[PDB]
C-alpha cells in the first residue's frame, strides 16, 4: 500500500481486550490505521499498575535515535512520555496542566478553609 506523500511516524498502537489497554510505541507511516501495519516494533507501555503498583514502559534508545535521524515525526502522547522519561525535553502543555491542577487544588483548599 503505497501512500502518496505521507511521512513515517513513531506512535502508539493499542492492544489488549476492553478495559485493558496496552500501548506499543512503534514506527509507522502517517496514513496507516491505528492498529495498522508498522516497520519496526520499538517498545511497549502498560497504563495499568502491576502488583508492585508501578507501571511498565520500555524504550529502545539506539533504534529510536536511528529512526529519528532517518526522519520520523512524533505524536503528542509518545513524546510526552519521552519527556517524562528524561531522554527528551519536558512538555510545556504538561507544565501547564500541572500548574492548573495545583491552582485548582489550592483554590479548593481555600474554599474548604473558608467553609470550616
Amino acid at each position: 500500500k503505497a501512500y502518496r506523500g505521507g511521512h513515517l511516524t513513531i506512535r502508539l498502537a493499542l492492544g489488549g481486550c476492553t478495559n485493558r489497554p496496552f500501548y506499543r510505541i512503534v514506527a509507522a507511516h502517517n496514513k496507516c490505521p491505528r492498529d495498522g501495519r508498522f516497520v519496526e516494533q520499538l517498545g511497549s507501555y502498560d497504563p495499568l499498575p502491576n502488583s508492585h503498583g508501578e507501571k511498565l514502559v520500555a524504550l529502545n534508545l539506539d533504534r529510536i535515535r536511528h529512526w529519528i535521524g532517518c526522519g520520523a515525526h512524533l505524536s503528542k502522547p509518545m513524546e510526552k512520555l519521552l519527556g517524562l522519561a528524561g531522554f527528551f525535553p519536558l512538555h510545556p502543555m504538561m507544565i501547564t496542566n500541572a500548574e492548573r491542577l495545583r491552582r485548582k487544588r489550592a483554590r479548593e483548599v481555600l474554599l474548604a478553609s473558608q467553609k470550616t
Partner: protein, 201 residues
C-alpha cells in the same frame, strides 16, 4: 498485458479543461460582508478574521488608488506590525492584477521583504495576499518608520549516557556536555512561506 487508453484520455482532458477554465482568483476571493461566505465554496470565515474582513480592504483594493499599484510604495503586514513593535514591510517588485475583476482588487504581486530589519537578497513571493489585513503607509513619515537598529544542557538521561560512554572510552571529561543554540534559528510563526508550495482550488 492489456493497455488502457480512456484513463489517459480523461486525465489529459481534465488537465486541459481545468488549466483552461480554472476559477478566477478574484471570483474565489470575493466575500459577501452580509453573511461572510466566499462564493463557490459556501465556507465560513474564521472568527479572528470576521471583523477584519468586515472592515478592512484587500491589498489590490488599496493599491488601485495610485498609479502602477505603487512600485516601491510602503505596504506593511498588519499582522506583523501588531504582533511585534518592529517594522516589517514588502519591497514589492512585480505586480499583476486580475483583469476579470471589476475593481481590480485581486492579483499577484511580490518582491523583496524584511523581518525585524532582516533584508533578503531575493525577490520571493508574498503569502496571504487575499486577507483584509493590509495597511498602506504614505511617503511622509517614511524614513522615521523604516528606521531600525549560548548553549543549553542536554537532557539528564542523555548526558548520563554520554558520561557513561566516555567513561568506558576512558577519558574523564568532567566538563558538562553542551550544544550550540545560537546556530538553531528558531523561527517565529509569522515567517512567510512559498505560495507555489501550497496548492489552489
Amino acid at each position: 498485458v492489456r493497455p488502457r487508453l480512456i484513463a489517459e484520455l480523461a486525465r489529459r482532458v481534465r488537465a486541459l479543461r481545468e488549466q483552461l477554465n480554472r476559477p478566477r482568483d478574484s471570483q474565489l476571493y470575493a466575500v459577501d460582508y452580509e453573511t461572510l461566505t466566499r462564493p463557490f465554496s459556501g465556507r465560513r470565515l474564521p472568527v479572528r478574521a470576521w471583523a477584519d474582513v468586515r472592515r478592512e480592504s484587500r491589498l489590490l483594493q488599496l493599491l488601485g488608488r495610485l498609479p502602477l499599484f505603487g512600485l516601491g510604495r510602503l505596504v506593511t503586514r498588519k499582522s506583523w506590525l501588531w504582533q511585534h513593535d518592529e517594522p516589517c514591510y514588502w519591497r514589492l517588485t512585480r505586480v499583476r492584477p486580475d483583469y476579470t475583476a471589476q475593481n481590480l482588487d485581486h492579483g499577484k504581486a511580490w518582491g523583496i521583504l524584511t523581518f525585524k530589519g532582516k533584508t533578503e537578497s531575493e525577490a520571493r513571493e508574498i503569502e496571504h495576499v487575499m486577507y483584509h489585513d493590509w495597511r498602506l503607509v504614505p511617503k511622509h513619515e517614511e524614513e522615521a518608520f523604516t528606521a531600525f537598529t549560548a548553549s543549553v544542557p542536554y537532557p539528564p538521561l542523555l548526558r548520563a549516557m554520554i558520561i557513561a560512554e566516555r567513561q568506558k572510552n576512558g577519558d574523564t571529561s568532567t566538563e558538562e556536555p553542551m550544544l550550540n543554540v545560537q546556530r538553531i534559528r528558531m523561527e517565529p510563526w509569522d515567517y512567510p512561506a512559498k505560495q507555489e508550495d501550497k496548492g489552489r482550488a
